[PDB]
Amino acid sequence: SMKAARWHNQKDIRIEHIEEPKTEPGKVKIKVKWCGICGSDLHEYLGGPIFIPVDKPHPLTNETAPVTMGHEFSGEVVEVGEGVENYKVGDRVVVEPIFATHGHQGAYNLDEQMGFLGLAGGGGGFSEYVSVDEELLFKLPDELSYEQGALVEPSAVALYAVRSSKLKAGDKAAVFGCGPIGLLVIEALKAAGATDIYAVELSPERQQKAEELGAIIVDPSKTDDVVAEIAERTGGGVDVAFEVTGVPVVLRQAIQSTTIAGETVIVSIWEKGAEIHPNDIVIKERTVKGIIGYRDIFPAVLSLMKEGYFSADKLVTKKIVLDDLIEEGFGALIKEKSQVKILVRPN
Amino acid sequence: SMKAARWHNQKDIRIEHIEEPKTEPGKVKIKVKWCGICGSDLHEYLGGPIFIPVDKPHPLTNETAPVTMGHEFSGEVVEVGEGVENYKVGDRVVVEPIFATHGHQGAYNLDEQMGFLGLAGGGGGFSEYVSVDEELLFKLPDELSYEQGALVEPSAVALYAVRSSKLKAGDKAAVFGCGPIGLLVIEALKAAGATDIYAVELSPERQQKAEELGAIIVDPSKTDDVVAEIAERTGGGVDVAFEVTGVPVVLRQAIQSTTIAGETVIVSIWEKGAEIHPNDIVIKERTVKGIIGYRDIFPAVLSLMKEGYFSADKLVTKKIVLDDLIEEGFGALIKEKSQVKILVRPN
Ligand SMILES: [Zn+2]
Ligand SMILES: [Zn+2]
C-alpha cells in the first residue's frame, strides 16, 4: 500500500509494498519527492549489516531487519499528527535523520544509543511515505527545489567537517581522496572561504569534478612526491588537510602536508590499524582531529544553498525511480567513478 | 681558566679546561651555580649527535662540535656587557636557552634555524662561566634558591604541554610513562587543577614518586586491560592523556583512554613509525596534539614556584660535581630508575 526498498540480508535489498504507516500523535507524514544514496547505503548493500540492527533490536527504534532505507531526503507534508502545530499539510520539508536518547541536544551525534533514520529503523526515504517526529524536521525554503532539499543531509557531513576545523577565510587546504564525500568537502571548503584547495586524486573523472568545484589537482601518478609538491606550492604546507581515502599511507601524507600547527581532519572510515610517524605530529606542533556524523548544522547548510553552494547542478549526476534502485542506483555507484550523488524518485 | 664539560663524539664527553669567555657588549657573564641533565643530554651521550652540529656549522651559533653542554641552569651575574641596563653585578638569574632567528618573538621554538644553548653552541651550563645575551635571562626571585632556578627549564617543558592542552580546572588526566619528564607533567597537571591523574607506570620506584606527586597508579602488570580500568574509574575516559613512553602500543592506549572529544598530547620522542587505530580518533571525535619545546612560559613557571609547585625538595634526587658527571650523573640516569632530576655543580 506503499512502495519501499527494504534491506533483508546482505546483497538482498527488495523493492516491495508494505502498509502505509499511521501518523501517530507526535509525527508528520511526508510524501517523499527525492532521496539520495549515501554510500553507507551502498556499504550495507555489499557488506552489511553495519548500522542496520539484525541480531538485537536497536535501543531507540526497537526494530530489527528488514528496515526501509534512505536518509538524505525531502518531501511534502501530507498529514499532520495530533500534537503538531508547526507544520501543516503542503509544507515542504527535509529531515535530519538522527535518533538520539535526549533528542537533538548536546552532542547527539555521539550519543551512545544513536541511530539513523533509514538505517536503525523509523522509516526511510526509499519509500513513498515516511512518518517522522516533528523534532527532526526543517522547513524547505521556497527558493530551493526538492532535489536541493535531498542534498541537505550529505552536504551536512561535509560542512560539519569544515566548520569543526581550524580553517579560516583565505586559508589553504588539502583534500586527500575526491570521491563523492571528498567532493562535498571541497564545496564546503569554498563556502568557508578556502582559496587554494589541493585535491589529491587518481581518477580522471573525479579529478574533473574537483576542478569544476574549484580545486587544484595533484595527480599522484604525475608527481614524484605529493607531500613535497603541496609543500612547494604553499611554502611549508596547507592549514588543514582532509583524509578521505582511509589508506594508511595517505593519512601519513595528509599530516605531512600541513604547515606549522596545521590540522589533519580524518573523515574516512577505518577497519584496520594504520602506521603513522608520531614524529611528524610532534615536530611542527600538528593536530589530528576526528569527525563523525554532524550536529546543529542543517540551518547553515540550508542558508548556504540559498547562496548557490552545494548546487544540485554540480553534485547530482543521475535521477532514477525507486524500481531501478538495484541496477541503476547501486550498480551505477559500483561501476562509474564519475557519479557524485544519485537521487531516487519513489514513482 | 675555566672547567667545562664538552661533547666531542658519541659516548665521548670530556671534562676539560677552556678559556673564560669575553663579556661582549650585548651579553652577560654568569657564574653558574647549578645545572640539570635533560635526558636530551643523556641522549646525545648514548646516541648523538642529534641536536649537536657536527658536519655543518649551526646557522645561528656558527659553531661546530665540540660544544659545551648544559641547559636548565641558574647562576650569579659576575660581569655585564656594554649595552646592558636591566642586570647589575650580583643579580641571580636563570636562562631560557633558545636561539631563534627573530629572537623570542612569535613561535620561536618552531623557528627554522632553531637551536638550544648547550647543544647548538654558545656555551653551556656544565661550565664555570657562560656568556649569554640578556634577552635569554630571567631574574631569579629571592624566594627561590639557585637549585630551584635550575628547575625552571625542565618545568617549562612540562607546563607548556599542560597549558597547550584543553585541560581545565577539575578535569581528569592520564600520564602514560612516568619517567623524569612524565613526573614533571604530573606536577604541572596539579598546578593547572587536574584532580584524578592516572599514572601508568611499571617501575615501583617511579610508581612511588608519582604517587607522592599526587597521582593514581595504574600498574599494567596488575590489571588485564589498562584503558578499561581508566575508562571506568572516570566514567568513559579522561579529558586529556599524555603519551611519554614512545612505545606504539601505548600511544594507542593513551588515545583510547580519553572520553568524548578527549585530547592526547604527545610528549615522547619518536624515530620509527607507530600503528594507531584512526577509527579510535573518529568514533569519539578525539584529538591528538603535538608539542615540542616551549615558548613564553618562564614567567608562569617562576610564579608557580613561588607557591610551592615544582619544588626542588620533591624533584632533585641527586647533586653531583661537574668532575663526576659521567659516572655519578649520566651513569646514574641509566641505572637508577629512582632518579628524577640530577643537578651538577661546577666546583
Ligand atoms: Zn548519510
Ligand atoms: Zn632540556
UniProtKB/Swiss-Prot annotation, chains A, B:
Gene knockout outcome: Cells lacking this gene have no acetoin reductase/2,3-butanediol dehydrogenase activity.
Entry keyword set: Cytoplasm, Metal-binding, NAD, Oxidoreductase, Secreted, Zinc
Domain of life the protein comes from: Bacteria
PANTHER family linked: GALACTITOL 1-PHOSPHATE 5-DEHYDROGENASE, SORBITOL DEHYDROGENASE
Similarity comment: family membership: Belongs to the zinc-containing alcohol dehydrogenase family.
Name by which UniProt lists this protein: (R,R)-butanediol dehydrogenase
Cofactors (names): Zn(2+)
Keyword Cell inner membrane set for record: no
Cystine crosslinks: none
Molecular-function GO term, any one: zinc ion binding
EC number in record: 1.1.1.4
Binding site for Zn(2+): C38, H71, E153
Cellular component, GO, one term: cytoplasm
Upper taxonomic lineage: Bacteria, Bacillati, Bacillota, Bacilli, Bacillales
Pfam families reported in the protein's UniProt record: ADH_N (PF08240), ADH_zinc_N (PF00107)
Location(s), subcellular: Cytoplasm; Secreted
Catalysed reactions, semicolon-separated: (R,R)-butane-2,3-diol + NAD(+) = (R)-acetoin + NADH + H(+)
Oligomer and partners: Homotetramer. Interacts with BrxC.
